[PDB]
């Protein structure tokens, strides 16, 4: 199994467009991902955290990966958001997404209402158990309120269709161990921490700020992967304006608000989620142009 | 606005019992109700978080409602679970579970998304807003992942059918000068800290303990009520044993196997939450005799 | 051995006096010690954090102690802070002010160096081996980087020289079974918490903010001693405000600057610590005045 | 300034050893330095905390700095320990290591009194204009319970003599951008973050492990400065179990009782620490053979 290959190495968790009712925007999607993948992307996970997966119903989330994968499906890797903290829930949309022709599953940790550890196994077996597609772990516990602790994280790789881990919790020094005990992928979750997983050993990145500098997050890879770390150091600090502007907005807010500026309109978050506030905006903007994503 | 009256003082946040095949038995929730009445408590949660709210669908919530109002509702006040992170879908449950006679809502903060503070206070009052009902906000952040600060319960306060709050996050001193300032009931929402909270002022319990110990639990309310502090605190020791099983289970884990050890089987667990083990089951059975509520 | 007799009810974690030049002003802390007394303190800990512990001398230390139980020895408690993250040291700190007279010891947990929790237990045991005194845990991990854990708590408590704990951990259910279970006296080391520690058992407070309103602290254990607890409720909303003061400023910046504001100099604080700037002198004196300890 | 040539790239926070009687053994210390140097560090820091600062005295550390300046000090840079929670005890430690003829100072957060961010520049200010050496910050939250805020970093860097912060905070993204900004150097505090450090632009690394790993260390800062990221990535995993046993035992016990393993007996450590129980030797033998440093 190619991971690199079969999920890609640069993904953006995409935004889901809604239009001014709040009802989804599949054609401002398409628009979306050839745009994202133009930019430099190998792949796009949909209906991500960043993609609003608590506000989307199951019919808007097949919609949306039927138009993305219409989209850039024949030269891009589109990974399916498919876990809840319902593991019946869960078993029905990966079978879901599956059928529509996802390339692989994207399962959270189940949130708020905190699974004990053999819990959280039989979960992610369940749900590795329902289809034939790669599934990458999705580490996040300040998020969902637990962690996928190390042997927990381990027992999983035992499954031969658990692949890899998205990682939100950076316990860089652990995930380096499960790296190289087990063979599963990293992929970085946390934008901040990306050139740090690089150096333990992370295939690539699941990246919120992608949907702005998509181009630089190519070629702080290449440059790594090619051994000038101080090119990729240089880069890194160059974009570290959007991680500091997502660390005050949140992804949902910063990439509705950032694509806004670039001149893609995707419409606003849907509550609980909100729309950044022209304050937030104008400071975003300063934080972009400091990027060079903004003129 | 009599809180007491209208909303209880001990509540347990009911099981949601299920079948051997894992279906929604309201046979047994009828049953279970009537018991728990029966014990002590004078008001009931359905659809909280220990009534499993992640893996039963809007159908069930309804199903077990219904038949919950109709076991206990002319002799017990009945409170929905209403809240999920989804701001749309929360306003649904809450229109639903008014239209069927839920005498109150408990409405949860957005878990897992981690919504701003004006999300929150959208969220909320665009819940509070939808029926007629009395609402207690339900603030978990060791759950929802972002607390309810204190700026945004007294924003919140005014409206006029938000009337309390069912505490999880232990901010004893802000909860105290929340209640002195504006009026806010106050329920505590963590077994362990019962005692605490009513020093500081709080109505009464949603308690998940409750389950197997709602004798003592109201005794402990009308010791504490009556000015017997030392007696409260006596009960409060009694009951210890079952705080720490629930420490070590979890509410849901907890309360199902300790129903079915003292004669009541409301079934297991929906994945992710699991049943016991055997062996957990023998040492809740022993803090379950410590307890003097088994044996 | 009767706690409250030996050790007190109503505790001042008294400042350390300076003069203008910096050096220790024994007659200020005699002033201060008697003011203490007077107004309802039935003990005092001299050398605790809050009298700046980390930058006075050991011979400071035993001056300090010599005054104050000069000063009010004959009716109040003087108990002496005699623990660093030192052993050796600990116990020769311990042994002078046992010499010196005082009437019990207040020993913190070993900061900053991490010590596993047998190396804790070794510590106290060791120091409550090296006098005849009456001695308190201090359980504060938010300074100390590590807690007493339960199990090392219950097992110090047969010592027979360790007979209590201040607590600023904040956890009330261990706390409270430690108190049932071992019979501990736990004192409260956390103004904010004074009332639910004293619903959980506690057998008075060690206090900061009685610097400024020791008479108020009294009527509230005199209050709740009696089962009026409503009266106890409103005098601890009465200081909130001092409480919230002390989470901006800390114990050292806001004693002897509201000591000041009253008309009672005690000089400032020794670096690292600093003196209140103009701004926050001018936000403690609105939370004094609301709290009617300052005009 | 050459802070590479001036401190060093691979330093040991070296143990201070003790003999049978606890008392200092300053041959022993000049042996292991010699011993240190030779297997690959340019510079040792001596009285840090794995050297035991918590329970030397001032003359033990200035014996210790004049022992391990004699052994290797022509020939690696040696860097003192000279901070605490007292500011003027601070100035006078390091005041004397200057006057022994220390090549730089090691300077930690004043721990367990929580001074506010002003009161830390004032502190560090007030040492660094005490003596000409460079100096190093020396950011540890976990210990000290008070990080130095990136703005105090930010202010403290135009000191002509702060060079530098050992980190220990593991804030790799703001580390990037102080660095990126300012030009201090940063060396990693916590070996389980060495590598990510290196790739966010670290000059080297202040170790523990390197008490038994020296060598492998030195190899993975040559692999990584040729820009060959995947053997410096094979060698941090086989050096990995060292650091899972430092997080087991911490590093004083850990380094002990390595070194004895090694053939290198340095005595136990002064109480509250504690030496490696047998059970305890067991497992870090395992690891040291994992790691390939024991036979
Ligand atoms: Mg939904
Ligand atoms: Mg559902
Ligand atoms: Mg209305
Ligand atoms: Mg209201
Ligand atoms: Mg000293
Ligand atoms: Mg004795
Ligand atoms: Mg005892
Ligand atoms: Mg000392
Ligand atoms: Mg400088």
């Known amino acids: 199994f190619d991971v690199a290959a079969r999920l890609g190495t640069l993904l953006t968790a995409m935004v889901t467009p809604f239009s001014g009712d709040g009802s989804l925007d599949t054609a401002t999607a398409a628009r979306l991902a050839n745009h994202l993948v133009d930019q430099g992307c190998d792949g796009l996970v949909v209906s991500g955290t960043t993609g609003e997966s608590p506000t989307t119903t199951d019919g ?47 399962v959270v940790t189940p949130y708020y209402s905190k699974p004990p550890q053999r819990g959280l196994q039989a979960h992610f077996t369940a749900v590795a158990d329902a289809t034939e597609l790669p599934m990458l772990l999705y580490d996040i516990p300040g998020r969902s309120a637990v962690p996928i602790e190390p042997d927990t994280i ?44 690089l150096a333990m050993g992370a295939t690539g990145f699941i990246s919120v700020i992608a949907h702005l500098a998509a181009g630089q997050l190519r070629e702080l890879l290449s440059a790594f992967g090619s051994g000038d770390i101080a090119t990729a150091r240089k880069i890194n600090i160059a974009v570290a304006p959007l991680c500091n502007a997502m660390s005050r907005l949140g ?12 001149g893609i309109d995707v419409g606003d978050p849907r509550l609980p989620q909100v729309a950044a506030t022209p304050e937030q905006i104008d400071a975003l903007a300063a934080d972009m142009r400091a990027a060079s994503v903004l003129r």
Chains 1, 2, 3, 4 share one sequence.
């Open 60 to 106: 808007e989330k097949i919609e949306l990966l039927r138009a993305v994968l219409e989209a850039v499906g024949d030269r891009a890797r589109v990974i399916a958001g498919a876990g809840t903290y319902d593991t019946a829930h869960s078993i029905r949309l990966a079978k879901a997404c599956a059928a529509e022709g996802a390339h692989g599953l994207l």
């Open 154 to 197: 381990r027992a999983l790789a035992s499954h031969p269709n658990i692949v890899g881990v998205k990682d939100a919790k950076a316990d860089l020094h652990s995930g380096a161990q499960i790296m190289a005990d087990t063979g599963l992928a990293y992929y970085s979750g946390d934008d901040a921490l990306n050139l740090p997983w």
């Open 251 to 262: 992804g949902v807010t910063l990439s509705k608000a950032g694509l806004r500026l670039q």
